Amino acid sequence: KTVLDANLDPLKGKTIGVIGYGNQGRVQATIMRENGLNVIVGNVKDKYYELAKKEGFEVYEIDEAVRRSDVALLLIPDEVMKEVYEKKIAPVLQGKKEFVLDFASGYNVAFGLIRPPKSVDTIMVAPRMVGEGIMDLHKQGKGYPVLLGVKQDASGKAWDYAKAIAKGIGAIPGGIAVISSFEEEALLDLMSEHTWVPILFGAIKACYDIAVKEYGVSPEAALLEFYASGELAEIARLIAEEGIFNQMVHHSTTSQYGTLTRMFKYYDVVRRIVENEAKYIWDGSFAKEWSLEQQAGYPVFYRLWELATQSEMAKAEKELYKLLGR
Amino acid sequence: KTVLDANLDPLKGKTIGVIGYGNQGRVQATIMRENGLNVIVGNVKDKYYELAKKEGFEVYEIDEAVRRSDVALLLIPDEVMKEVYEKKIAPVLQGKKEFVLDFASGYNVAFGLIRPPKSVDTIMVAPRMVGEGIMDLHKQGKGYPVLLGVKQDASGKAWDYAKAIAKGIGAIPGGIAVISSFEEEALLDLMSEHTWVPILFGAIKACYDIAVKEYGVSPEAALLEFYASGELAEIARLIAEEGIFNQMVHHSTTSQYGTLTRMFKYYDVVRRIVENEAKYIWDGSFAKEWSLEQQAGYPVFYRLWELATQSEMAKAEKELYKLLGRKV
Amino acid sequence: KTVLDANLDPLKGKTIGVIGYGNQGRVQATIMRENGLNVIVGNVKDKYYELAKKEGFEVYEIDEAVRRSDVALLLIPDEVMKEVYEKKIAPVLQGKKEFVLDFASGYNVAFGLIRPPKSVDTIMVAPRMVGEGIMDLHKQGKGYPVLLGVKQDASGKAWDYAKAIAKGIGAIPGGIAVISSFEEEALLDLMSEHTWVPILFGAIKACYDIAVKEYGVSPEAALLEFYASGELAEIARLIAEEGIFNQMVHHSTTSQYGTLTRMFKYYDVVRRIVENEAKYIWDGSFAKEWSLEQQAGYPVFYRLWELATQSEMAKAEKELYKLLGRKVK
Amino acid sequence: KTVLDANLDPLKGKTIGVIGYGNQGRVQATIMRENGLNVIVGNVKDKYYELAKKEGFEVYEIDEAVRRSDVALLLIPDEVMKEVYEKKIAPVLQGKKEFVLDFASGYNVAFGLIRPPKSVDTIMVAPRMVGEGIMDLHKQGKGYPVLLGVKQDASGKAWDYAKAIAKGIGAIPGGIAVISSFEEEALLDLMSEHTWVPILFGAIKACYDIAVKEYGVSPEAALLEFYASGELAEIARLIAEEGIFNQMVHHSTTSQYGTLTRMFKYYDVVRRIVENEAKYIWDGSFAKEWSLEQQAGYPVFYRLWELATQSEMAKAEKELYKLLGR
Ligand SMILES: [Mg+2]
Ligand SMILES: [Mg+2]
Ligand SMILES: [Mg+2]
Ligand SMILES: [Mg+2]
Ligand SMILES: [Mg+2]
Ligand SMILES: [Mg+2]
Ligand SMILES: [Mg+2]
Structure with a gap:
């Protein structure tokens, strides 16, 4: 209701x-x-x-x-x-x-x-x-x-x-x-932070890492494709205003076909991830993991922050954002 | 001695x-x-x-x-x-x-x-x-x-x-x-709480869930077979008085044959479970797991209590026990 | 209804x-x-x-x-x-x-x-x-x-x-x-005799066999933990009177936590066993198996009785039950 | 004792x-x-x-x-x-x-x-x-x-x-x-009939079938190697009189080396077979299987007799034994 x-x-x-x-x-x-x-x-x-x-x-x-x-x-x-x-x-x-x-x-x-x-x-x-x-x-x-x-x-x-x-x-x-309910709101909040968000950032990092290391793409070209241009924010606005699929009519047919085919292709893979993370929230397992990370003095939190901010992608992002004046 | x-x-x-x-x-x-x-x-x-x-x-x-x-x-x-x-x-x-x-x-x-x-x-x-x-x-x-x-x-x-x-x-x-010894008594106590007890409750829940969802059995029929009748307590008494196998003489030959064949069939599966849980007690691993659950504020304990008491079987058990006039 | x-x-x-x-x-x-x-x-x-x-x-x-x-x-x-x-x-x-x-x-x-x-x-x-x-x-x-x-x-x-x-x-x-129904009652009766009962007895035997052979526990200590005390009968009574989960409030929090975590951990394993045994009842397969055991003169029934009653656990149980003054065969 | x-x-x-x-x-x-x-x-x-x-x-x-x-x-x-x-x-x-x-x-x-x-x-x-x-x-x-x-x-x-x-x-x-004991004697008798005997006959048939079908060996040459000469009976006598290993001293060093190495090589395979057949005797399973074969009117017994006696090896054995006058 x-x-x-x-x-x-x-x-x-x-x-x-x-x-x-x-x-x-x-x-x-x-x-x-x-x-x-x-x-x-x-x-x-x-x-x-x-x-x-x-x-x-x-x-x-x-x-x-x-x-x-x-x-x-x-x-x-x-x-x-x-x-x-x-x-x-x-x-x-x-x-x-x-x-x-x-x-x-x-x-x-x-x-x-x-x-x-x-x-x-x-x-x-x-x-x-x-x-x-x-x-x-x-x-x-x-x-x-x-x-x-x-x-x-x-x-x-x-x-x-x-x-x-x-x-x-x-x-x-x-x-x-x-x-x-309390359980439902906690589940919904954590599902986002543990599935589509980290999957998105990981996929974007993998795009950068593969483009640069394997295909000889300049860091700046790779950053401009994968997030550093406006692209992500104007798609996110049209998703909220028109709908996640309805919004795709504004892109080339090539783009629509590629996204539709690959979304259906990889649904089962991201579904397994979502099932595993949801189960681990709902059990209380994540609350124990995070409470114990805090009590241990945040050493994984600390080191993953260092590794994310010191990644080849993050260093290149810093140089590009300097060059564009941000 | x-x-x-x-x-x-x-x-x-x-x-x-x-x-x-x-x-x-x-x-x-x-x-x-x-x-x-x-x-x-x-x-x-x-x-x-x-x-x-x-x-x-x-x-x-x-x-x-x-x-x-x-x-x-x-x-x-x-x-x-x-x-x-x-x-x-x-x-x-x-x-x-x-x-x-x-x-x-x-x-x-x-x-x-x-x-x-x-x-x-x-x-x-x-x-x-x-x-x-x-x-x-x-x-x-x-x-x-x-x-x-x-x-x-x-x-x-x-x-x-x-x-x-x-x-x-x-x-x-x-x-x-x-x-x-202290180690032996702790091992024995925890082996029961981590193997045959949870395996028994799981098996009983799976009997209920399969009977009801897959075979169209009424919640009441399923509960009456799997634990809600006296059955479990009078078998438990005869096990303690006569012996775990000796006690089986009081059941039908059909029942004896089914239990004996399936006990030998599934021994290796439950043995692997017992081996894994015993090793994890004896190492100190369980003591660390439980101490850390307490220090984290019991969130798994809390949520598993909710999920057990809000299960299809637990809800149906509440309705049946009301209908038979037992404390709720 | x-x-x-x-x-x-x-x-x-x-x-x-x-x-x-x-x-x-x-x-x-x-x-x-x-x-x-x-x-x-x-x-x-x-x-x-x-x-x-x-x-x-x-x-x-x-x-x-x-x-x-x-x-x-x-x-x-x-x-x-x-x-x-x-x-x-x-x-x-x-x-x-x-x-x-x-x-x-x-x-x-x-x-x-x-x-x-x-x-x-x-x-x-x-x-x-x-x-x-x-x-x-x-x-x-x-x-x-x-x-x-x-x-x-x-x-x-x-x-x-x-x-x-x-x-x-x-x-x-x-x-x-x-x-x-006839089919439903036969299914329910046999599901118990073919799943949770034999799984329980097997798990108890494995507890005994592992405690004694691998951890150096005395037969008498192992038997007193796993079934030979009152334990099983007073839990079985509280399950019938209060409920299978409600009954757990009377045990230590350590006991509750251990049982809850391991019950959810092993549910899928015992569920596979229950699915397989139910299917084999419902088909008529078990009725054929048992009818043919009878017509063959009960040789598996006979030998499994011998092997259960001559197990290390059954022999130790006889000695302990003698020592405590209970009915002995 | x-x-x-x-x-x-x-x-x-x-x-x-x-x-x-x-x-x-x-x-x-x-x-x-x-x-x-x-x-x-x-x-x-x-x-x-x-x-x-x-x-x-x-x-x-x-x-x-x-x-x-x-x-x-x-x-x-x-x-x-x-x-x-x-x-x-x-x-x-x-x-x-x-x-x-x-x-x-x-x-x-x-x-x-x-x-x-x-x-x-x-x-x-x-x-x-x-x-x-x-x-x-x-x-x-x-x-x-x-x-x-x-x-x-x-x-x-x-x-x-x-x-x-x-x-x-x-x-x-x-x-x-x-x-x-009754159980021990029944176990010992049936272990032989269900393991080393059928393994021996199967291995001999496989020797014949592989020699003839894959290596172009004449049926008569293959039969003369694998059992149709005296070989099997004089080894069996020396095993009983001198011992199973002691008996091997009478063969070439080439023969001893080949047999010793391959016996240790294949022990684990035949051990699995022996374990499985022994367990199935000791349970009563074999007694049920045989009792039910009798009550069903021996159809497997009947057909396996036909398939053994009508095998390429059995037919060739008949022709060779005729030719040698047996
Ligand atoms: Mg969110
Ligand atoms: Mg105890
Ligand atoms: Mg019955
Ligand atoms: Mg019953
Ligand atoms: Mg305790
Ligand atoms: Mg013999
Ligand atoms: Mg040679």
Whole structure:
């Protein structure tokens, strides 16, 4: 099912704590205030505390913000969220008889890394839009798409709170709110980061490496074909506006034929990759792998960053981007 | 060897601290007191502290219980034992000149996760019986089987302490005490949890999934065949009383023939699984895997629990157990 | 569907012949009489004839019992049923214009080894409960589960007769009667005997053989871990009472994690075995294999019995069971 | 262990029924009588009844012979023994409180095809010698080898009866009596018939087929190499007299080197065959296969006889043996 509008009433006369004043936090706080909700901000004292104060919000330490709140949006990065939840939020939530904890990312709840108490409505309103894009579309009077989820319905009104927040943050009406789940949103997010993105970058690197090492192509010619021209961004725009296949009518018949035949040829290969990565997300295996990479001090993350940025392709890219003035 | 009785004398006039008043702790404490030994209990103030107080035991914080004790039985879950040992026990043991630390589980000592100091007798008395079963058999005047082990003989009497505790907790006489080790007991415990148990549950799930998806069998018929009837529990009783093969005489010849032929047919397949899991326990690989699952916050444990309890079979089981009026 | 109760009326004023006074026969006869049905017994003159006479039943030769009956329950072992049906029952059934022949086992009808005539309602009421368990639950006023099936609806009332017998034998109400079939019941029974049971015993034997031969474990330690303690029976009870996964909450987290990870790890391997054994049942292949083992004089059955009972594990089990004071062969 | 002599006393003052007056029966009966034992014969009224009568034995129907006997040797072919045991022996044995039933072949008892009652000593005295060979060696005052077994010790003296019969039939002293079993004797007999014998004949046929079809060798040359000369019988004699390897000293060094290297080269291949055939005997699988071949009316036996006797090698053998006058 889909949701095109909602009643804002379950959030009326409630103190709403936006924890974290980053990309998502600033935008979700600002727009909820513009729709006349009582919004405070929780944040450590960074630049982000200052900016929230400067944009007229009551700003507190995270534990205080949660103490004062009936509803909190935990909009901090996933990789620090567990520490902050356990030290500054969970102790306060032992006190509350009723509470609504919202997330924009399913990861930590989906894999059981954060388990709010039985009394807490655990809900998700997860945009598919960067944050600069959300401000832009709100200024134009338009909405954006979100995924909704409820892990734990303590109150019996968790879905109403989720729909309410979706209206509050300016997603609906004008955009859509899709009925989803914490597990589903985490799966979808990670499937992209672990399949089509890395397959795309690998394929582009292999194009460069084969063109240059085996066919005697200049680094600059190879870079200009494989990504360094505008090409990739104007195809990506037509995919979003017209459709992934519909968009192909603007290319030569030679191009259409080559892409269609090779897409069907290699579907089974990329399908096996997608199946294996999806299974490994859904099991919890990826959450264990990444948690243990963090606890080990990021040595694989560190070395793969070095090897990617010191690749023949990355070095040639640096020289070409210098030569073109970027 | 095996041991059928022992001298209780090495425990006489000694304070015996049972750390943890769970399944094993309650029973080992109760029976040691009934055999006239000076038993205190170490435990945080949970429900378990309340029950121990109500059953007439002096109860202390774990560090106090150890300070007051000449002998302690560390009968808490293996998954919290390292933290509790390091924070509440090891500091106290730096003080002691003589001490006996007993375990009912070899795991933490076998994989070096708990290394008591050189002055401490590190011993094991590990039952093969649930705890409800131990109380039942003590009330009937009968013993039960235990595995004995000694990692570290500081005193030169560690084996006497082990045999003594075996008598103390009512294992012997009447039952047996088998000469074993921390490594052997940990290996045996984990071999079951990693081979025949998961193979059994998997085989039962595959029977359900194939019957229902491929042969059009009703969920209810499939559940009633594969486990939801009494069948499994009365075969398990006859295996323990008469023997695993001897027990088969009570089934049809058709059933005997089918089971015998298919057991020999698939032995090599399940043997490969057993070999691989045993090797991976014995190396320490499983201890690293499980320790790292805990430190990562149990995400695989969490998700596999969800996937097992949300399986077609588990959902159908819930509906059928409701319909038959069993707890859900 | 499922059935929780039924009208007993289609069996009222009818003579019901229980053929065979073994585990299932004695119980189904006794309980049908206690519910006020006209029950006679057919049996050869064994100890079982004597016991039926002593428990107050009219007892006859099998052919006589069938001649006198409107309804018969053929509750004899599957491996002798074909001979007895062909010699003592089929000739009598050529005579009858109406008849209800009930089985507690689908095997012989499912694989076409017994094909009653077109005029006979061929029906199945198949318990999932041993027989000592059925008497126990009837004494407590409770029912038990059965599978119902109809191969041949001659009368147009075969399903009513099946539900009726289910009530008659004290399955319902209190228990359930599941709508099933001869083929389905035979498949389900044999799938267990050919997959999870032999896989379990093999896995337990391999645990013993590896622990003892490769890790230097004492026979007695290995036997106490793998089955010779109470362990298996109290897990089997909690599986039936709480559920197969729900039951795991009573074990250590270490135990839960080990079992869950390894169950998912090895599912595909045991699934292949289940697929292969199910296909071989459903084809009739197993019925041919077993029929030919019987006709050959049971030489594989005989030798596999010897090899199982003379295994290192079976010999050690005998010594340990002696030492603990349990029944020893 | 081994047994070189035994006390004949457990058979003294007992009626000994030899059932079957074939190769083994005639010889075991004759020699037991010559050692002063009370020997009667059971047999159907064939030529063999006549011969037993003519050689001075009391001869009866099989059931009568068993009724009159304290000890019987069931020395009839294995492939008829089950029928004869069930119809003419088992009914009589229901009556006996004590009895000793001896076999010269383990097959039927080993695979449970004949199961004498709990009260019967079920024993085996199994020669390794044809029967013409046993008469020959008794006339020379020498013994021969037997395997002893006991399936069922009802009396507690079954082993003494087995050793006694071994002395009775003139095996010991002079020869040996090896402690064995029904299963072991059946296994040993069938291992030969299912491994080295058929491997030998197959290898000889393959030598013929390859020489003739691929190397243009005349059928007569190929037959003269591979078996039709004396070669095979004089090697077989020296193997039995001197030893399987010791015997090789009489051949060229070229021959020794070729045989030693190729024996070690192919050991693993023939070992796999031996393992597979032994396992299939020991399980009871072969007993089921053969019983079902008989019940199906011998169609594989019949067709394989045709294909062996109608092979290019068998036809050429017939022409050559005609030409040499055999
Ligand atoms: Mg994404
Ligand atoms: Mg265990
Ligand atoms: Mg059965
Ligand atoms: Mg069953
Ligand atoms: Mg355990
Ligand atoms: Mg031979
Ligand atoms: Mg030569």
